């Protein structure tokens, strides 16, 4: 009951905040060490927020062979306890 | 987490009162009572009690701020251990008949835990020590029962393994605890404890001996070995010390070297010179262990462990003079070592449970964790 | 129920549940039967992120418990170095006195929390403030044998903030 | 006068010498005697060294009081058992003299820190007279069983000391005192006396027991009563304190209440589980007394007890007497009910009356009593070193 509909990367506003507006207003260009904001859209309403938050994780990979040893792959949950 | 100790106002009293009530109920259901040498027989157990309480309570009070806990926790441990050892030696050797010999043997079983606890004192609270006492007495009784079943020896005579069992149990439990010092008045009180232990240790080496000449020779050998070990330990402490000074802490543990080394063979040594040689060799080995063991947590318990192993080895050497028995005795030793290590591991993983409210690793060796002191902020 | 769940989440460090409760309308200044709010519990348990988040949502920093202890008092008694640092960084009064006259410096000194003692001294804690017994942090550290705290208190002297 | 104490000491010693020359004439119980000796001189003496500035007075006045006490108790207890005639001295006379010393030391527990050595000599003499008379009454007229002397020693000494301290009440000490405080190493030293008393109490309750089943029962019952008492005292000390902390007063004293409350039933067939029940009840009662009754006695009843000897000796001694009565009820002994009850009542009443008279005598300003500000301080009577 946590199906994703679409994800808005909010390229224009994040690119303005990250001083990458001159690059694009459609592709997300972000500078490391600065927070950027995305919007996650669900297919159906989320009844209970906390168990749904426990069930979701995000992963960022770069390159063709991402690995945790190369720091090319990272897996983090969605929580207020995350390391900013 | 919170370094301020959690309240034990509901854990410690409920735990202790439940233990005491269970002991009372078991004593009612299973224990029973029933001459010329009543006082003489009482004297051996009384010497054991004096050693267990006083010597083993004050000997580990050398800590600048843990002397209260050392002495009082040793008293509590002895009081619990004697009762539980009475019940368990009754259960694993047969209704339980309480004689003075049974109380003496229960005191020996409690002394095993009291020796083991020196490796963990300052890093545990009272409830963890209760768990240690119960599990260690159970393990020692199980070891004696297993030896009696396999090697067809008497259950009470298997209690000669208690030095090495206590040493390895204490080492194994201390190894499982979370990881992290001396004053002058605390070191003097500890000398008092060590002196009482050293003076009455010939009673440790002959409580289980029935023949009067065997007790004669055992006490003589222990007395002379302990004298030689005192001389060797006090004089050789300067060599095994970086600043070439005598260490009170080394002397406290190493004075017992001769008594430990001849404990299993004091009744087999025929002449006092052999006991003196064994005491001298034990003192030299104590010096070497002080000079080497810290290189390769408690150094005094490590040297006690190596001394107990040496005592068992010299038992093996001397028993041949007085090759299948060699194999059987090495097997008994190895079984004792394995059971001590396994039970120490079990106790260590039991003590690491969060429910015991163990002190924070920054609050080790501090009486303020367990005791009331004036002019302190209490609570939140 | 909602306030109790919020306080339990603050004690356990569950910042997501506490933020959910604050979103649903739970008052941030609610306290338990001992007068301890979420800031006090988070300071006790060393939950730095929860402490910072609760400070952002306008919790009253100088709220005392039924014993008169502020969050800084509790963090000093519990020896939470980072929580003490953050509470001071957000303007906690380092010279606050409880009902019996204890200061955060006194609680840090009596518990042999050398880092908290050093930080409090560097932030202008006055070690001449006595309790109702007339005891100073130096006196209680001398009584309890905290030799490092005694040495640091003597060496600092009156260097101030 | 600074010469009152040496004068009284010399005169009392000369009187002891004359009395011994007038009344006194010349081995299996010697180890038990030596255990009782260790109890009397180390256990009581160092048990009292918890006060930070009264350790010299505690141990030294313990030694002086007990040394006078053994001689005077020897003389008085002999002249009663001899009915005014010459008597011989054996090991049992020595054991009973140390018992009289124990009673006087228990009463000294109540007035520790507020009395002079001269007052101590006077109270030693008078209290030994009263104690020996009451003990003769219990042992020969009532013929009650008090082999461990919960009634004749512990309860008697506690209520004698309480009566003396009530007569010697100071208004300026009711709200506490600056010197009435323990130190860290002082409690470490008090643990020595606690441990020696705990270790040797089975010999205390079995020294003059009838050889055979009675002596063995006394030893075993005392041992198991103390074993249960330690656990219950630790548990209740944790229970009554904030956050479950342990109180060193409790661990120092309430751990020995099992040896007091088992004394009457020591040689009786009360079984080890019954002895452990008695020891647990004694430990709980002692801890509760220390926590609640001592402040009520000090503030409301205007009876100040320095070492809390009520909670260690009186209430456990009364519990021991009641346990003796209950043991008589259910066939554990052939002694009468009414004789046990009369022994308890006579012990308590004689202790109170003798303590009243002795305290009235000690209240005369002739013995160098310390001032209110100088209480619990060695420097009033001792040369004190500059450093601890
Ligand atoms: C032995 C104990 C438990 C019971 C008997 C004690 C009685 C007889 C004692 C102890 C308390 C005593 C009182 C305590 C205080 C004072 C104040 C003083 O200015 C005059 C005597 C007076 C009024 C005492 C009279 C006697 C007294 C009532
Ligand atoms: C403190 C006051 C109320 C005295 C009461 C103490 C109670 C708990 C003590 C005192 C006398 C004791 C009893 C004395 C005799 C008997 C019979 C014996 O075969 C077994 C033990 C038993 C059953 C004891 C049990 C405990 C006992 C009842």
Q: How far is D277 from chain B (nearest CA, A)?
A: 7
> What's the distance, CA D148 to chain centroid?
12
DSSP secondary structure string for all residues of D257-283: HHHHHTSTTSSSS-HHHHHHHHHHHHH
Give burial (CB, 10 Å; 0-12/13-18/19+) of D19. Answer: middle
Question: CA D161 to CA D105: how far, in whole Å?
Answer: 9
Domains: count for chain D: 1
Map out the domains of chain A with their CATH numbers: 4-84 (2.60.40.10)
Look at chain C and count its residues.
Answer: 161
D332 lines ligand 2 (CB under 6 A): yes
CA nearest B190: which of B17, B34, B56?
A: B56
CA nearest B279: which of B215, B231, B216, B238?
A: B231
Question: What residue spans of chain D are helical by DSSP H?
Answer: 4-23, 30-38, 44-47, 55-81, 91-110, 117-136, 156-167, 184-204, 213-240, 248-253, 257-261, 271-288, 294-299, 309, 315-329, 337-362
User: Does D374 reside within a domain?
Assistant: no
Does the beta carbon of B16 lie under 8 angstroms from any beta carbon of chain D?
yes
Does the beta carbon of B72 lie under 8 angstroms from any beta carbon of chain D?
yes
D98 and D43 Cβ atoms separated by less than 8 Å: no
Q: Indicate the SS3 state at residue C37.
A: strand
DSSP secondary structure string for all residues of B249-294: HHHHHHTTHHHHHTTTTTTT--SHHHHHHHHHHHHHHHHHHHHHTT
D144 and D138 Cβ atoms separated by less than 8 Å: yes
Q: Indicate the SS3 state at residue B200.
A: helix
B370 and B125 Cβ atoms separated by less than 8 Å: yes
D355 and D167 Cβ atoms separated by less than 8 Å: yes
Question: CA B254 to CA B258: how far, in whole Å?
Answer: 8
Q: Which residues of chain C are within 8 Å of residue B354 when distances are taken between CB atoms? A: none
B146 and B200 Cβ atoms separated by less than 8 Å: no
Ligand 2, atom 27, lies closest to the CA of D274
B247 — phi, psi (to 5°)?
-105, 125
| Half-sphere exposure of residue B205: CA atoms within 13 angstroms, side-chain side | 35
Domain ranges of chain B: 10-369
CA nearest C110: which of B366, D300, B83?
A: B366
User: Does D380 reside within a domain?
Assistant: no
CA nearest C106: which of C134, C66, C64?
A: C134
Question: CA D227 to CA D218: how far, in whole Å?
Answer: 14
CA D97 to ligand 1 centroid distance, Å:
30
Exp. method = cryo-EM
R_g of chain B, CA atoms, integer Å? 20
Question: CA C75 to CA C84: how far, in whole Å?
Answer: 6
B228 and B283 Cβ atoms separated by less than 8 Å: yes
**Pair type for strands A39-42 and A4-8:** antiparallel
Does the beta carbon of C20 lie under 8 angstroms from any beta carbon of chain A?
yes
Give burial (CB, 10 Å; 0-12/13-18/19+) of B323. Answer: exposed
CA nearest C110: which of D50, C87, C120, B121?
A: C120
For residue D258, the domain's CATH number is 1.10.3430.10
Ligand 1, atom 27, lies closest to the CA of D166
Beta bridge partners of B63: B182
Q: Indicate the SS3 state at residue A28.
A: coil
User: Does D381 reside within a domain?
Assistant: no
Tell me how far apart the terminal alpha carbons of chain C are, to the nearest angstrom. 44
Question: CA D21 to CA D26: how far, in whole Å?
Answer: 11
Question: CA C50 to CA C18: how far, in whole Å?
Answer: 9
Which structural domain range is residue C145 located in? Answer: 1-157
Write the CB contacts of D343 (distance below 8 Å, at least 6 apart in sequence). D138, D142, D144, D146, D151, D152, D321
Q: Indicate the SS3 state at residue B217.
A: helix
A70 and A56 Cβ atoms separated by less than 8 Å: no
Where on the phi/psi map is residue C68: left (φ > 0), alpha (ψ -120 to 50), or beta?
left
Question: What residue spans of B1-99 are helical by DSSP H?
Answer: 11-30, 38-50, 56-58, 67-91
CA nearest D249: which of D202, D286, D199?
A: D286
CB contact under 8 A, D223 and B103: yes
Beta bridge partners of C31: C37
B302 and B250 Cβ atoms separated by less than 8 Å: no
CA nearest C32: which of C2, C57, C7?
A: C7
Q: Indicate the SS3 state at residue D80.
A: helix
DSSP secondary structure string for all residues of B156-189: GGGGGGHHHHHHHHHHHHHHHSPP--B-HHHHHH
C118 and C153 Cβ atoms separated by less than 8 Å: no
**Pair type for strands D87-88 and D24-25:** parallel
Give burial (CB, 10 Å; 0-12/13-18/19+) of D140. Answer: exposed
Q: Indicate the SS3 state at residue A77.
A: strand
CA D277 to ligand 2 centroid distance, Å:
8
**DSSP designation for B153:** -
B194 and B252 Cβ atoms separated by less than 8 Å: yes
Look at chain D and count its residues.
Answer: 388
CA nearest C108: which of C66, C88, C138?
A: C138
Which structural domain range is residue D298 located in? Answer: 3-363
D324 and D265 Cβ atoms separated by less than 8 Å: yes
Interface of C with B in 35-54 (CB under 8 A): 36, 40, 44-46
Tell me the helix, strand and coil percentages in chain C, rounded to 5.
55, 0, 45
Question: CA D114 to CA D106: how far, in whole Å?
Answer: 15
Write the CB contacts of B296 (distance below 8 Å, at least 6 apart in sequence). none
Question: CA D329 to CA B246: how far, in whole Å?
Answer: 63
> What's the distance, CA B34 to chain centroid?
30
Q: Which helix (H) or strand (E) holds A60?
A: strand A57-61
CA nearest D192: which of B321, B195, B2?
A: B195
Kindly identify the ligand whose nearest atom is closest to the C-alpha of D276: 2
User: Does D342 reside within a domain?
Assistant: yes
Question: CA D348 to CA D151: how far, in whole Å?
Answer: 8
CA nearest D92: which of D33, D173, D37?
A: D33
Write the CB contacts of D205 (distance below 8 Å, at least 6 apart in sequence). D147, D148, D218, D219, D221, D222, D259, D262, D263, D266
B232 and B278 Cβ atoms separated by less than 8 Å: no
DSSP secondary structure string for all residues of D34-78: HHHHHIIIIIHHHHTTTBTT-HHHHHHHHHHHHHHHHHHHHHHHH
R_g of chain C, CA atoms, integer Å? 16
Does the beta carbon of C74 lie under 8 angstroms from any beta carbon of chain B?
yes
Q: Indicate the SS3 state at residue D88.
A: strand
D37 and D99 Cβ atoms separated by less than 8 Å: no
In angstroms, the Cα distances linking B105 to B108, B155, C130 are 5, 11, 55
Q: Which helix (H) or strand (E) holds D303?
A: none
CA nearest B49: which of B195, B163, B200?
A: B200
Q: Indicate the SS3 state at residue D350.
A: helix
Question: CA D247 to CA A7: how far, in whole Å?
Answer: 64
D65 lines ligand 2 (CB under 6 A): no
Question: What residue spans of B299-363 are helical by DSSP H?
Answer: 299-321, 324-351
CA nearest C73: which of C92, C60, C57?
A: C92
Q: Which helix (H) or strand (E) holds A80?
A: none
Question: CA D265 to CA D218: how far, in whole Å?
Answer: 8
Write the CB contacts of D216 (distance below 8 Å, at least 6 apart in sequence). B33, B38, B100
CB contact under 8 A, C74 and B380: yes
In angstroms, the Cα distances linking A27 to A10, A23, B341 are 9, 8, 63
CATH code reported for the domain at B10-369: 1.10.3430.10
User: Does D373 reside within a domain?
Assistant: no
Q: Which helix (H) or strand (E) holds D25?
A: strand D24-25
Question: CA D109 to CA D252: how far, in whole Å?
Answer: 14
Tell me how far apart the terminal alpha carbons of chain B are, to the nearest angstrom. 15
Kindly identify the ligand whose nearest atom is closest to the C-alpha of D110: 1
Question: CA A15 to CA A8: how far, in whole Å?
Answer: 13
Chains in contact with chain C (at least 3 beta-carbon pairs closer than 8 A): A, B
Residue to test with chain D: of B27, B55, B183, B191, most D Cβ within 10 A: B27
Beta bridge partners of B228: none
Q: Which helix (H) or strand (E) holds D85?
A: none
Helix orientation angle between B11-30 and B67-91, rounded to the nearest 10 degrees: 30
Beta bridge partners of A7: A40
Q: How far is A80 from chain C (nearest CA, A)?
A: 6
User: Does D346 reside within a domain?
Assistant: yes
CB contact under 8 A, B377 and C79: no
Among B38, B76, B367, whose Cβ lies nearest the Cβ of D216?
A: B38
Q: Which helix (H) or strand (E) holds B371?
A: none
D165 and D304 Cβ atoms separated by less than 8 Å: yes
Q: Indicate the SS3 state at residue D163.
A: helix
CA nearest B46: which of B97, B87, B89, B107?
A: B107
Question: CA D106 to CA D126: how far, in whole Å?
Answer: 14
Question: CA D220 to CA B335: how far, in whole Å?
Answer: 35
Interface of D with B in 156-195 (CB under 8 A): 181, 184-185, 187-189, 191-192, 194-195
In angstroms, the Cα distances linking A31 to A15, A17, A18, D365 are 9, 10, 6, 92
B62 — phi, psi (to 5°)?
-65, -15
Write the CB contacts of B178 (distance below 8 Å, at least 6 apart in sequence). B123, B352, B358, B361
Q: Which helix (H) or strand (E) holds C86?
A: helix C81-89
C59 and C39 Cβ atoms separated by less than 8 Å: yes
Question: CA C81 to CA A58: how far, in whole Å?
Answer: 32
Helix orientation angle between D91-110 and D30-38, rounded to the nearest 10 degrees: 10
In angstroms, the Cα distances linking C6 to C2, C12, C62, C120 are 6, 10, 20, 30
A74 — phi, psi (to 5°)?
-140, 135
D323 lines ligand 2 (CB under 6 A): yes
Q: Indicate the SS3 state at residue A42.
A: strand
Among D29, D245, D273, whose Cβ lies nearest the Cβ of B371?
A: D245
CA nearest D284: which of D255, D318, D323, D249?
A: D255
Closest residue on chain A to C14 (Cα) = A81
Hey, CA dihedral for C90, C93, C94, C97, is it positive or negative? negative
Tell me how far apart the terminal alpha carbons of chain A are, to the nearest angstrom. 29
CA nearest C86: which of C49, C125, C115, C118?
A: C49
H and E: helices and strands count for chain C: 10, 0
Neighbouring C-beta atoms of residue B326, cutoff 10 Å? 12
Question: CA B160 to CA B209: how far, in whole Å?
Answer: 11
CB contact under 8 A, B3 and C145: no
Question: CA B302 to CA D376: how far, in whole Å?
Answer: 46
B293 and B299 Cβ atoms separated by less than 8 Å: yes
Please state whether at least 3 CB pairs lie below 8 Å between chains A and D: no
Kindly identify the ligand whose nearest atom is closest to the C-alpha of D278: 2
Question: CA A11 to CA C100: how far, in whole Å?
Answer: 58
CA nearest B140: which of B167, B121, B119, B120?
A: B167
Please state whether at least 3 CB pairs lie below 8 Å between chains A and C: yes
B33 and D217 Cβ atoms separated by less than 8 Å: yes
Question: CA B313 to CA B329: how far, in whole Å?
Answer: 10
Q: SS3 sequence, D224-247? A: HHHHHHHHHHHHHHHHHCHHHCEC
Hey, CA dihedral for D323, D329, D332, D338, is it positive or negative? positive
B265 and B318 Cβ atoms separated by less than 8 Å: yes
Give burial (CB, 10 Å; 0-12/13-18/19+) of D90. Answer: exposed
Q: SS3 sequence, B71-128? A: HHHHHHHHHHHHHHHHHHHHHCCCCEECCHHHHHHHHHHHHHHHHHHHHCCCCCCHHH
**DSSP designation for B374:** S
B127 and B11 Cβ atoms separated by less than 8 Å: yes
B231 and B283 Cβ atoms separated by less than 8 Å: yes
User: Does D59 reside within a domain?
Assistant: yes
CA D163 to ligand 1 centroid distance, Å:
7
B33 and D271 Cβ atoms separated by less than 8 Å: yes
């Amino acid at each position: 009951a946590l199906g994703i509909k679409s994800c808005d990367f909010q390229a224009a506003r994040n690119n303005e905040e990250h001083h990458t507006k001159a690059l694009s207003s459609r592709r997300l260009f972000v500078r490391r060490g600065q927070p950027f904001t995305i919007i996650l859209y669900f297919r159906a309403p989320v009844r209970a927020f906390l168990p749904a938050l426990k069930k979701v994780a995000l992963t960022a990979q770069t390159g063709e062979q991402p690995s945790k040893i190369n720091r090319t792959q990272a897996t983090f949950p969605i929580s207020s306890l995350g390391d900013r | 987490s919170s370094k301020y100790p959690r309240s034990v106002r509901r854990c410690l009293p409920l735990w202790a009162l439940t233990l005491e009530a269970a002991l009372i109920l078991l004593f009612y259901f299973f224990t029973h009572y029933d001459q010329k040498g009543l006082v003489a027989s009482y004297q051996v157990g009384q010497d054991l009690t004096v050693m267990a309480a006083l010597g083993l309570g004050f000997l580990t009070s050398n800590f600048r701020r843990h002397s209260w806990s050392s002495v009082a926790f040793n008293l509590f441990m002895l009081a619990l251990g004697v009762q539980w050892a009475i019940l368990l030696d009754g259960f694993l050797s047969q209704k339980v008949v309480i004689t003075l010999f049974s109380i003496r043997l229960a005191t020996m079983s409690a002394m095993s835990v009291l020796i083991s606890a020196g490796a963990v004192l300052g890093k545990v609270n009272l409830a963890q020590l209760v768990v240690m006492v119960l599990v260690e007495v159970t393990a020692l009784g199980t070891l004696r029962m297993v030896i009696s079943n396999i090697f067809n020896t008497d259950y009470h005579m298997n209690l000669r393994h208690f030095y090495v069992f206590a040493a390895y149990f204490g080492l194994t439990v201390a190894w499982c605890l979370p990881k992290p010092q001396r004053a002058t008045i605390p070191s003097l009180s500890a000398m008092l404890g060590a002196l009482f232990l050293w003076m009455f240790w010939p009673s440790v080496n002959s409580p289980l001996l029935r023949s009067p000449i065997q007790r004669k020779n055992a006490m003589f050998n222990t007395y002379y070995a302990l004298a030689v070990s005192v001389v060797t330990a006090i004089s050789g402490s300067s060599l095994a010390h970086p600043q070439r000074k005598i260490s009170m802490t080394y002397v406290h543990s190493a004075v017992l070297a001769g008594g430990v080394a001849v404990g299993t063979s004091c009744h087999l040594i025929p002449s006092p010179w052999l006991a003196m040689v064994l005491g001298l060799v034990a003192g030299l080995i104590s010096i070497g262990g002080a000079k080497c063991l810290p290189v390769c947590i408690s150094v005094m318990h490590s040297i006690f462990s190596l001394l107990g192993l040496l005592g068992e080895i010299t038992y093996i050497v001397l028993l041949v003079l007085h090759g299948f028995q060699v194999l059987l005795s090495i097997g008994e030793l190895s079984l004792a070592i394995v059971i001590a290590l396994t039970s120490g591991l079990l106790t260590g993983l039991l003590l690491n449970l969060k429910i015991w409210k163990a002190p924070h690793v920054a609050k080790y060796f501090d009486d303020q964790v367990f005791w009331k002191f004036p002019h302190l902020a209490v609570g939140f | 129920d909602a306030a109790t769940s919020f306080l339990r989440a603050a004690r356990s460090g569950n910042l997501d549940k506490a933020l959910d409760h604050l979103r649903n309308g739970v008052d941030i200044n609610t306290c338990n039967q001992n007068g301890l709010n979420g800031l006090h519990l988070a300071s006790k348990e060393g939950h730095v992120k929860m402490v910072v988040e609760l400070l952002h949502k306008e919790i009253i920093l100088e709220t005392t418990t039924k014993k008169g202890n502020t969050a800084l008092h509790i963090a000093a008694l519990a020896g939470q170095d980072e929580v003490v640092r953050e509470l001071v960084n957000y303007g906690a009064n380092v010279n606050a006195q409880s009902q019996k006259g204890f200061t955060p410096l006194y609680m840090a000194a009596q518990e042999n929390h050398l880092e908290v003692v050093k930080f409090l001294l560097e932030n202008g804690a006055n070690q001449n403030v006595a309790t109702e017994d007339g005891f100073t942090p130096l006196a209680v550290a001398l009584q309890q044998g905290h030799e490092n705290v005694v040495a640091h208190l003597i060496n600092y002297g009156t260097k101030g903030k | 006068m600074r010469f009152t104490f040496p004068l009284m000491a010399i005169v009392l010693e000369i009187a002891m010498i004359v009395l011994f020359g007038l009344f006194v004439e010349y081995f299996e119980l010697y180890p038990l005697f030596q255990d009782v000796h260790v109890m009397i001189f180390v256990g009581f003496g160092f048990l009292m060294t918890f006060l930070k500035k009264y350790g010299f007075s505690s141990v030294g006045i313990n030694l002086l009081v007990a040394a006078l006490g053994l001689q005077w108790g020897t003389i008085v207890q002999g002249i009663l058992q001899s009915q005014g005639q010459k008597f011989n001295i054996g090991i049992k006379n020595m054991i009973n003299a140390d018992f009289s010393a124990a009673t006087v030391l228990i009463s000294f527990g109540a007035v520790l820190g507020k009395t002079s050595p001269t007052q101590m000599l006077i109270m030693t003499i008078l209290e030994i007279v009263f104690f020996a008379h009451n003990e003769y009454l219990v042992s020969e007229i009532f013929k009650a069983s008090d082999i461990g002397a919960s009634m004749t020693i512990h309860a008697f000494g506690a209520y004698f000391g309480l009566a003396v301290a009530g007569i010697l009440y100071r208004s300026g000490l009711r709200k506490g005192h600056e010197n009435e405080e323990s130190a860290y190493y002082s409690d470490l030293f008090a643990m020595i006396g606690t441990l020696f008393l705990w270790m040797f109490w089975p010999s205390f309750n079995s020294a003059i027991a009838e050889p055979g089943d009675k002596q063995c029962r006394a030893i075993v019952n005392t041992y198991f009563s103390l074993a249960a008492c330690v656990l219950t005292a630790f548990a209740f000390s944790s229970l009554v304190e904030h956050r479950g902390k342990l109180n060193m007063v409790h661990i120092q004293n309430a751990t020995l209440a099992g040896g007091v409350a088992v004394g009457t039933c020591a040689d009786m067939a009360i079984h080890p589980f019954g002895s452990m029940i008695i020891g647990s009840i004694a430990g709980m009662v002692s801890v509760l007394g220390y926590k609640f009754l001592t402040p009520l006695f000090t503030t409301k009843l205007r009876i100040h007890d320095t070492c809390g000897v009520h909670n260690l000796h009186g209430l456990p001694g009364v519990v021991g007497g009641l346990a003796g009565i209950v043991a008589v009820a259910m066939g554990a002994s052939n002694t009468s009910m009414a004789m046990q009850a009369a022994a308890l009542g006579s012990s308590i009443g004689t202790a109170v009356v003798g303590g009243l008279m002795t305290g009235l005598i000690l209240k005369l300003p002739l013995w160098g009593q310390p001032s209110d500000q100088n209480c619990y301080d060695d420097s009033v009577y001792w040369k004190v070193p500059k450093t601890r």
